[PDB]
């Protein structure tokens, strides 16, 4: 969680993401996958300010495991496997997925890297305690 369940965000080729370079390639609103904790596909989110959001999103659909794509037009994550839908922040807004996409703490380091750590606080979307904890 602190150091044990922590992961350096990596790109498709397994190379550590360089944040400055990453932001130079992803504009505000961008949501793209990176390799996260245990290598899980995790959305890196670029804010309106053009910064890495304080949280990432584990893209594994809570229904049956498909990696949920981001639909710019619908402004929602929509799973093509069985139609589950989640809002801009990953809150499940349409089943069959029972739970929201897992939040992941996303932190920019001093050595220009992105670190993912388990999100243990309150789920600011449901108020509920993380189902992923
Ligand atoms: S795996 Fe996403 S709706 Fe079934």
Curated annotation (Swiss-Prot):
Enzyme class: translocase
EC number(s) per entry: 7.1.1.6
Localization of this protein: Cellular thylakoid membrane
One GO molecular-function entry: oxidoreductase activity, acting on paired donors, with incorporation or reduction of molecular oxygen
Primary location: membrane
Reactions listed under catalytic activity: 2 oxidized [plastocyanin] + a plastoquinol + 2 H(+)(in) = 2 reduced [plastocyanin] + a plastoquinone + 4 H(+)(out)
Subunit structure: The 4 large subunits of the cytochrome b6-f complex are cytochrome b6, subunit IV (17 kDa polypeptide, PetD), cytochrome f and the Rieske protein, while the 4 small subunits are PetG, PetL, PetM and PetN. The complex functions as a dimer.
Membership in a protein family: Belongs to the Rieske iron-sulfur protein family.
Name the UniProt record assigns to this protein: Cytochrome b6-f complex iron-sulfur subunit
């Amino acid at each position: 969680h602190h150091i044990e369940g922590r992961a350096v965000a990596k790109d498709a080729l397994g190379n550590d993401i360089k944040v400055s370079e990453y932001l130079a390639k992803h504009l505000p609103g961008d949501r793209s996958l990176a390799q996260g904790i245990k290598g899980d596909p995790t959305y890196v989110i670029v804010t309106e300010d053009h910064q890495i959001a304080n949280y990432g999103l584990n893209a594994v659909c809570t229904h049956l495991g498909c990696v949920v794509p981001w639909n710019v037009s619908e402004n929602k994550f929509i799973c093509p496997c069985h139609g589950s839908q989640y809002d801009s922040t990953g809150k499940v807004v349409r089943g069959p997925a029972p739970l929201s996409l897992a939040l992941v703490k996303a932190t920019v380091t001093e050595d220009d890297k992105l670190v993912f750590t388990p999100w243990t606080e309150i789920d600011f979307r449901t108020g509920k305690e993380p189902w992923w904890t």
